[PDB]
Write a protein that binds this ligand. Structure first.
Ligand code: HEM
Ligand code: F0M
Length: 137
């Protein structure tokens, strides 16, 4: 289930992070407005850059912290507030997060693996709600 999925993801964090982020960018190419330094690069061109693996790992590490601190796939309001208040997230609205989680769920469903995709889809919806409650537009 969800807890075991956090363990699976953490076990190969950088690899899963890169592949999920790429699934996101490729599903929603307009989302690349937020990642101007990744424009004009294929998946393997991105993965080769140490900065890409470094960024994606730090992002997914925080995502896994947030997931692990959730109760029944409902994240803490404090974690939602951290995500709203991060300077790096100043342009963002809840739809940016919605899309990330639609891509993450789709990736899990297409994986050969027994991820609890419905738990991830609830977690994304609950995180969107929590972001809104913590003041994201
Ligand atoms: C639960 C979801 C998310 C988590 C945990 C998260 C976490 C983080 C973290 C930790 C950083 C700093 C990374 C580092 O040290 O290298 C970061 C940067 C950033 N995040 Fe997020 N993020 C999330 C979702 C999003 C979404 C949906 C977007 C936009 C679609 C976004 C846009 C950014 C951008 C633009 C930066 C700045 C990257 C740069 O320096 O070039 N994040 N995020
Ligand atoms: C949508 O923002 C991100 C998401 C991920 N990821 O692994 O889901 C990595 C880096 C990011 O900037």
């Amino acid at each position: 289930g969800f807890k075991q999925d956090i363990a699976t993801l953490r076990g190969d964090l950088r690899t899963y992070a890169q592949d999920i982020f790429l699934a996101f960018l490729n599903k929603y190419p307009d989302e690349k407005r937020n990642f101007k330094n990744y424009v004009g690069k294929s998946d393997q061109e991105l993965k080769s850059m140490a900065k890409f693996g470094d960024h994606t790992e730090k992002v997914f590490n925080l995502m896994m912290e947030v997931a692990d601190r959730a109760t029944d796939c409902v994240p803490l309001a404090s974690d939602a507030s951290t995500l709203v208040q991060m300077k790096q997230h100043s342009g963002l609205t809840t739809g940016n997060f919605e899309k990330l989680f639609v891509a993450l769920v789709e990736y899990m469903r297409a994986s050969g693996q027994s991820f609890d995709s419905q738990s991830w889809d609830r977690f994304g919806k609950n995180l969107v709600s929590a972001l809104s409650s913590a003041g994201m537009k």
